[PDB]
Structures are given as structure tokens and as C-alpha cells.
């Protein structure tokens, strides 16, 4: 139980840095995709109403 806990605590400690970096990297991709889709939808709605 103590030998199996050595590899489990070492893997759980390193997983905290990867989980926090994955959430921060996904937030930048979601904000850039939502901002680019908002400018494309606003330009397409204004062009469809003008046409």
C-alpha cells in the first residue's frame, strides 16, 4: 500500500500543473473563437439586411 502510494502521489502532484494549464489554454481558444464568430455573425446579419 505504501509502494503503490508513491507512484500515485507522484502522478497526482504532476497532474495539478497540467490540469491548470489545460483550463487556461482552453479559455484563450474559446474566447478567441467566440469573438471571431461574433464579428462574423454581426457582419453577415448587417449584409443580409442591407441586401
Amino acid at each position: 500500500d505504501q509502494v503503490s502510494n508513491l507512484k500515485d502521489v507522484v502522478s497526482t502532484t504532476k497532474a495539478l500543473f497540467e490540469m491548470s494549464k489545460e483550463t487556461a489554454a482552453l479559455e484563450a481558444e474559446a474566447f478567441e473563437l467566440k469573438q471571431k464568430v461574433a464579428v462574423a455573425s454581426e457582419a453577415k446579419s448587417v449584409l443580409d439586411s442591407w441586401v
Binding site: 509502494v3 484563450a28 453577415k44
Partner: protein, 145 residues
């Protein structure tokens, strides 16, 4: 990549159940947000917008500024709070097993060879190993409690 080994990574205490559930929910929602969204910029159909608008030079000026650069909710790697905590946690858990977990394996191998083996001389060495084995059994129940 381990649900099989990631959920059983904690010890006997149930205090790590709240921390493990929050990390698994944030990791699953991060991959679903990048896959559901488009992996490109924007279309910006300027060929049908500049000729349909009533105002002259209206859709042409807005298409050049949107295709350049703008701001987004991003951050840098300066606040490495989780990166510094990974090295400190391994010194008290992974590095601590070299003197606690490794010492139990060496004591168990010497006690098994002395209790199974010359006669009266080997019985004296096995007597001291029996006391250490009995104390380890009582400490094993206290470590899980």
C-alpha cells in the same frame, strides 16, 4: 492515461475526493469547448457586403480592422502556482518513499530469511526480527486509521 488509476490515486483519507472531482470536471469541459467551436478565424464575406450597403466605404473599412488583430481573454505563464507546488509535493511524497517505503522492504526480506533458518544462534537474530514485525503490524492498523 489513468479513470481506473486516477480515482484510486488517493490514500485512505476521503479528503481528496473533492479535489479529484474538480480536476476531472475541468479537464473534460476543456476538450469539449475546443472541439465544439470552429478551428478557424472568420469568413467575413466582404464581396457581398460592400456592394449591398447604402453607406459608401462602410463595409470595406470594417473588414480591414477585423482581419488585423484584436484583444482576447488570455493570460501568460507568469503565475505558475501549480508548477511550483508539484515540485514541493514530490519531495514529501515521492522522495519520502526512499527512506520509508524502501526501509520496509529491506526489513521484511531479512525477517523472512531469519525466521525460516544456524539453530540457537539464528534464533536470537530471529527474536529481534519478530519484535519488529509485530510492531509493524500494529503500526499498519494505526496508519490506516
Amino acid at each position: 492515461l489513468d479513470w481506473t488509476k486516477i480515482v484510486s490515486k488517493l490514500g485512505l483519507s476521503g479528503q481528496t475526493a473533492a479535489a479529484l472531482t474538480s480536476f476531472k470536471k475541468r479537464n473534460d469541459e476543456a476538450k469539449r469547448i475546443l472541439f465544439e467551436l470552429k478551428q478557424q478565424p472568420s469568413n467575413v464575406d466582404f464581396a457581398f457586403y460592400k456592394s449591398t450597403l447604402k453607406n459608401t466605404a462602410i463595409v470595406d473599412k470594417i473588414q480591414s480592422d477585423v482581419s488585423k488583430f484584436t484583444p482576447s481573454k488570455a493570460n501568460l505563464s507568469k503565475q505558475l502556482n501549480l508548477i511550483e507546488s508539484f515540485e514541493a509535493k514530490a519531495l514529501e511524497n515521492a522522495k519520502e518513499t526512499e527512506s520509508v517505503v524502501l526501509a520496509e522492504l529491506t526489513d521484511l526480506e531479512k525477517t523472512l530469511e531469519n525466521i525460516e533458518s544456524x539453530x540457537x544462534x539464528x534464533x536470537x537474530x530471529x527474536x529481534x526480527x519478530x519484535x519488529x514485525x509485530x510492531x509493524x503490524x500494529x503500526x499498519x492498523x494505526x496508519x490506516x486509521x
